[PDB]
Amino acid sequence: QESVKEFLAKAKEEFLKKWESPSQNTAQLDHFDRIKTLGTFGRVMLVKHKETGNHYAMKILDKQKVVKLKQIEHTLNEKRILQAVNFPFLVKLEFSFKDNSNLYMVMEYVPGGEMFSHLRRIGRFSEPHARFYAAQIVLTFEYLHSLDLIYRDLKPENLLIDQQGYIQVTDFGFAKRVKGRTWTLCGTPEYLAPEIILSKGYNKAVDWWALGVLIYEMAAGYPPFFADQPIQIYEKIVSGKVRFPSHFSSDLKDLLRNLLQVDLTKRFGNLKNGVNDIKNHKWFATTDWIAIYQRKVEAPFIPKFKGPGDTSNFDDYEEEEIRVSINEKCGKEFTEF
Ligand SMILES: COC(=O)c1ccc2[nH]c([C@H]3CCNC3)nc2c1
């Protein structure tokens, strides 16, 4: 429909303006009070802005460790993309800056926790619950792919649940602007598409494979390919031999066979009709795509939390210093940050 085409054309226009002229250096560390480590080359810490009182999740990357782990380009991708995107189910970057030691990305805080926590607490999501989340990912990937962005890190740990019960996708550390193919081995083993494992030039079809893994994990409670060693996971993935729980609906199994298609040229999301083969699949027949985008659907689950500074949906980590060297480190490598 023309209304969707015009939406995506405007979305790309607005992305490209920010992409071509990124914001830089929009706060500094002593504008914030450190509250708690929420997850831990990098950590995420809950901080409070000292003037406004607003809460944020501050991702901190050690420049020397980024260089050693060969993640310079990836880190620059992450911040350049995050400051340029705008979509209801993406985390909101409010500030970024750097100092002698670290890179900082300060995002609006999402107190409801990772989807992974809730999935493991409940066991598995019902198909309507899994479908509510999946629809948000389908729309988010339609948006990102229209901007020539691949995401490359879908998994329940990267999907935050907000105060309305909707998703905010976080961690763009592997996201990249790609026209055509790309080649970097990255991702999480359980979620890797076969063509990544086989060191091929691959494209945005790897995100649709990962959506199949996510939907399986949400509806079953565990991922389709797992083993104690990644090499064993990889052998299962490239076989693509998938066993479905008997409680899966026939529509769900049919969608998953088409997302977990080892031949990328036959995989849903990567055919001539693109995302519409997924949106029009029988498993999504009850989904009101517009209502999801507009956040008008009542969510199946609202996280329990007491206020915008509550950390009870995240877990406990050793609290370490945020050290800033007296000397500048790796200044040249991160000039554009
Ligand atoms: C807006 O962002 C936040 O509120 C936020 C909170 C906790 C987080 N934990 C992580 C790690 C663990 C999963 N992969 C990245 N990202 C987080 C982001």
Side-chain angles (χ1 to χ4, degrees), residues 1-4 6-17 19-40 42-50 52-64 66-67 71-91 93-107 109-119 121-162 165-199 201-230 232-234 236-240 242 244-271 273-281 283-297 299-303 305 307-325 327-331 333-335 337:
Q1 284 196 5
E2 281 73 20
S3 56
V4 169
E6 293 303 313
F7 175 91
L8 295 175
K10 183 180 295 287
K12 190 166 193 191
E13 285 157 3
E14 300 188 352
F15 167 80
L16 286 176
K17 184 171 182 289
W19 180 253
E20 291 179 356
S21 306
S23 56
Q24 299 173 67
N25 192 41
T26 52
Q28 63 200 223
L29 183 61
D30 67 16
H31 291 176
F32 305 89
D33 284 318
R34 165 227 189 114
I35 310 299
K36 198 167 192 299
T37 298
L38 305 172
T40 189
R43 303 167 271 179
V44 180
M45 285 185 356
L46 177 64
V47 303
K48 185 171 164 179
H49 193 282
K50 287 152 76 178
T52 64
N54 291 328
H55 290 89
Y56 298 98
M58 173 185 284
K59 182 175 182 166
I60 308 171
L61 300 174
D62 181 313
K63 283 187 281 171
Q64 296 182 134
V66 170
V67 174
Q71 297 301 302
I72 300 170
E73 182 186 349
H74 284 167
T75 299
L76 300 176
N77 287 337
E78 176 170 28
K79 177 252 177 179
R80 197 176 174 180
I81 294 165
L82 278 177
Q83 62 89 39
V85 293
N86 167 38
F87 199 67
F89 313 123
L90 298 176
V91 293
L93 181 74
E94 297 293 347
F95 312 97
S96 70
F97 55 91
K98 61 198 180 188
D99 61 24
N100 283 347
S101 291
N102 306 311
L103 315 169
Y104 306 83
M105 288 173 287
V106 183
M107 297 166 285
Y109 176 50
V110 181
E114 300 175 1
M115 179 195 292
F116 186 60
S117 295
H118 300 294
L119 176 59
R121 268 210 204 76
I122 301 166
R124 67 191 184 205
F125 298 150
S126 73
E127 291 190 30
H129 189 170
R131 174 161 44 242
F132 172 80
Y133 293 148
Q136 295 170 63
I137 300 306
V138 170
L139 292 168
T140 300
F141 283 179
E142 177 180 36
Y143 170 84
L144 292 175
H145 294 172
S146 78
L147 277 35
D148 309 299
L149 299 169
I150 319 190
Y151 175 62
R152 302 198 294 192
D153 209 11
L154 190 71
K155 53 183 180 182
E157 297 86 339
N158 284 345
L159 305 180
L160 306 168
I161 307 302
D162 72 17
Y166 282 72
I167 288 172
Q168 298 201 24
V169 181
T170 193
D171 201 342
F172 278 63
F174 296 146
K176 182 183 179 184
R177 191 148 195 256
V178 170
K179 292 199 198 54
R181 305 159 287 171
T182 201
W183 281 261
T184 306
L185 169 64
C186 60
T188 308
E190 291 85 353
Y191 276 74
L192 295 186
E195 58 268 30
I196 304 180
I197 288 159
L198 300 167
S199 294
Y202 61 85
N203 61 24
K204 302 184 172 59
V206 303
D207 281 338
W208 296 123
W209 171 281
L211 174 66
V213 180
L214 181 79
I215 292 171
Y216 186 113
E217 185 172 359
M218 291 191 294
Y222 51 86
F225 317 106
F226 60 90
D228 264 71
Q229 294 304 120
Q232 300 172 297
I233 301 167
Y234 298 157
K236 291 171 195 298
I237 288 163
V238 172
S239 97
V242 178
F244 299 112
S246 59
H247 64 80
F248 278 20
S249 69
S250 295
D251 289 340
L252 177 55
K253 295 187 286 185
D254 187 80
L255 172 65
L256 292 175
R257 288 183 203 279
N258 283 290
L259 289 172
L260 300 175
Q261 166 57 252
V262 297
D263 181 343
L264 66 93
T265 75
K266 299 175 175 180
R267 186 180 301 145
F268 267 29
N270 202 40
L271 310 183
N273 284 331
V275 73
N276 298 319
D277 289 326
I278 297 168
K279 291 190 184 177
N280 292 330
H281 190 279
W283 193 69
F284 283 111
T286 60
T287 298
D288 187 335
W289 293 98
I290 293 169
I292 295 282
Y293 170 82
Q294 295 178 350
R295 279 167 174 259
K296 293 179 172 170
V297 176
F301 170 81
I302 308 295
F305 67 105
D310 192 358
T311 60
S312 68
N313 282 287
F314 299 94
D315 294 316
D316 296 339
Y317 303 85
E318 183 178 342
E319 298 288 351
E320 299 183 87
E321 295 280 13
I322 302 164
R323 263 222 78 237
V324 177
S325 167
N327 304 293
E328 191 193 43
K329 314 296 186 176
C330 310
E333 286 83 353
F334 296 100
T335 300
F337 190 100

